[PDB]
Amino acid sequence: NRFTANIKGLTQASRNANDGISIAQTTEGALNEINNNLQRVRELAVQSANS
């Protein structure tokens, strides 16, 4: 009985962990978009600096 419980818990635990990776990837997409927007802002600031 103990082994069955562990096996169930491990698989389910494994099944939830994939979800954590998915959440990280989702955050990364948004973060990547933010970074892209930021790169443009820095370039614009450099252009803006000239007298």
């Binding site: 600096a49 000239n50 007298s51």
Partner: protein, 50 residues
């Protein structure tokens, strides 16, 4: 030798040339920036560094 009626015409030319070098420096601009009207420093951001 030059008469004073000569010097009047030469002065008319000289004042017109000086009005012209006052005009072409007073109102000349690259992107709305009077280059010769006033003295100042234009700083160029030539690098990613500050």
């Amino acid at each position: 030798t030059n008469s004073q009626s000569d010097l009047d015409s030469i002065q008319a030319e000289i004042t017109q040339r000086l009005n012209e070098i006052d005009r072409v420096s007073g109102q000349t601009q690259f992107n709305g920036v009077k280059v010769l009207a006033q003295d100042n420093t234009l700083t160029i951001q030539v690098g990613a560094n500050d």
